[PDB]
Symmetry: C3
Subunit: 318 residues, 3 copies
């Protein structure tokens, strides 16, 4: 009935809509293969702050939710679906950490190693606790895959090359089982808003994160980064082709969780253009970046215009 009680966790995904984008506009300002466009770095300055403000506000309201109604938090945690959203704040904070604007650090040779330890203490603690709790047959909504690759990226950025290999191995081990189990029962059309958002978006995006983590850790675009990227591209093509355009769709706030895969799948190709200099690669990167940015912007406008003039966004007594 009150505002605090009627608050879904999916609001974390809203941050995932923006923070990942904050990465891409940095790459377009520093990509050696995209110097034809005069993309000023100032475009990155007015996105990182917005993402940080959104994260701060959402974390604030969630903490105010926990301090008052603990029974709601306990009920939400003990769910077969909503567990995957408990890794969201760490991932969003890590994506914000990677994309610091150049103005803050004139010489960012290496970031201080405190942030990585601070952000992987609780992450491994929560992951181990969740896995142990669930272990005591569909092990697809209780294992984390995306966080390991982002952590490998962060560790490589900090300066611990050796550490990031462990995270990459753990992420690969956790991803193989999920890919084996889930692919046989992949959701069909007219099921995107059918209470599966925390699961099927971070399964077509993790293949792309590996293509970035491996390239960052090794520095050479070998065959390892040229296969996971193509697997992600094939999945993207399958989703684009199989969807039913004739049936159509209706607006939902839950669509914000499906913008992360296509947003993180364009930095992969913009970092792939650097390896193979050619017209098709640059055209593909540009068109994917354009469509991702346009969809993000139109979704933001729609959710802004559907929240203030009308007060029907928040469901009551879920």
């Amino acid at each position: 009935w009150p505002f605090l009680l009627r608050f879904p966790i999916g609001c974390f995904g809203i941050c995932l809509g923006l923070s990942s984008q904050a990465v891409l506009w940095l790459a377009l300002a520093k990509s050696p293969a995209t110097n034809f466009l005069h993309i000023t770095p100032l475009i990155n300055l007015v996105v990182w702050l917005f993402s940080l403000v959104v994260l701060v506000s959402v974390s604030f309201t969630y903490i105010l939710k926990c301090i008052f109604y603990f029974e709601a938090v306990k009920r939400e945690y003990f769910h077969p679906v909503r567990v995957n959203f408990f890794f969201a704040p760490w991932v969003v904070c890590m994506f914000l950490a990677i994309s610091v604007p150049p103005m803050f650090s004139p010489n960012r040779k290496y970031l201080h190693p405190a942030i990585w330890c601070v952000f992987m203490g609780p992450y491994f603690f929560l992951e181990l606790k969740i896995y142990g709790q669930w272990l005591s047959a569909n092990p697809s909504s209780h294992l984390s895959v995306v966080g390991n690759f982002v952590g490998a990226i962060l560790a490589s950025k900090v300066g611990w090359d050796e550490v990031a290999k462990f995270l990459w191995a753990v992420g690969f081990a956790h991803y193989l089982v999920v890919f084996v189990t889930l692919y046989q029962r992949l959701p069909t059309s007219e099921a995107l808003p059918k209470e599966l958002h925390p699961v099927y978006s971070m399964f077509i995006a993790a293949p792309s994160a590996a293509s970035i983590a491996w390239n960052t850790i090794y520095g050479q675009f070998d065959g390892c980064s040229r296969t996971c990227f193509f697997i992600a591209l094939f999945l993207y093509i399958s989703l684009v082709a199989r969807i039913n355009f004739f049936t159509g769709f209706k607006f939902s706030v839950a669509w914000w969780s499906y913008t992360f895969p296509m947003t993180t799948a364009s930095v992969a190709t913009i970092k792939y253009a650097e390896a193979v200099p050619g017209y098709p690669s640059r055209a593909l990167a540009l068109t994917l970046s354009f469509i991702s940015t346009a969809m993000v912007c139109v979704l933001f406008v729609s959710t802004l215009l559907h929240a203030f003039v009308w007060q029907t966004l928040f469901p009551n007594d879920l």
Copy 2:
């Protein structure tokens, strides 16, 4: 009751018996490690034409089947087993495309790129349609594995090295799930003609096709091509050892679908001899090629002598 109605799709496999062989006799005429044998290229000329004629005749009779009795085609398509034979004509045509005799093209530096696009338009269309139809728990008789590796070979031959990597990645992704699911319930003895031919032959042959596609695309026999080939060899050894010779077997026209794996597993070793010059490798390649050719020839003679003098080959009202 009539000839047109009583016509199984497995006739496509007959082409798979010959066209793949047309590849091998080309390799034996150009293998640098098999120049001791004075294998004239003329042996390849009188096999490619035969395979093309067989394909033309079988395609003709199948088209005449479709134009008259559409209900039979609809019933055959909506089956849990017979779907896998709907990828056969494209694979056979592609194998015929790879093994063009040298006489036709005096300087075959690169084939024209039209053929690959013409042959992968419908192939991807059909694969996507079939997967989407089945998705809407044994996902082993509705996914294609062999076609991707042959397409990678064809794309590498044409001149698009970059394209063939995508097909290789897709084939690997589709093969891993099939290998995981099927290996736990591998068919036992006295079950080869038990209505499973479209499935278990293209599971012990796809591991060998990768060893050829990777070598062709990269040009160096690295460790990637030295593991899938050994997996295929181990599967071959298991089939040879476990089969019950005491029980015996009876002649069946359906045996023509099991000659493709051993035929395509000998070009792998004849292209593996080129990497490691040694007596055991050459002996293994020669003996596998000999046994495959002998079995193909004896099967052809048996099916020819069991078709004209006696009119009991075609079952009535399946």
Copy 3:
């Protein structure tokens, strides 16, 4: 009722407690990264003989068991759990073969190839027979994984580099399915002595054996050996963290089968220190070796003091 009838097969695991250790004390006497410690080779001399004596005695009593009560052997073999112990003698003998003290062979450039063939005749025969018997849905207690990597190590030591690749490929193929199937139902706490010892120890140790076999066969610590080792380390960390220390545990003779994984996971890190010269790697190797040796010694003392003064070690009429 009699001694011969009341004899479990798990006694083979006792040899696995010692023979693997005989390897480690050899490495500490020859590791270029552990020359600070003045570890004399004499420590290896008084362990290999002990392991050989234990193996001889246990094999003797098991043969005397088979010659008298064949029905007991038949009943033990036809069990859903006890099959995995039928590969133990070959593995222990192979581990004894690898760790021959230097004094016996002044110039051990290459071992004679007879031993490998003698030890892989029966091994492949038994593996194929067991797989064929079981095939005619939890395929986790009838497939062998560890033996292939040890065989690859032995073949590389003998001088047949090419042969050991086949064993590595077979081991990888058999391990992938086991890892996929078993990881979803990994045993929880208070279940280590719950009649699962032949299964869950050789699943957290096989990942480490690959890191040694690949390094031995190729001679360069590439990325292949730096991922399976980390997977094994992650599994080790998960076991250490998740176990319930508050509940405690009671002594059991069956604990001897769980000392093999941590014993074979320390030679991996002592051979990993040679690739990356650094303080953390050496400290990790030293502490793992110390804890493994201490646990082995305390378990041996406990099982010696629980066998002679008290006669309650052997259960009657299992």
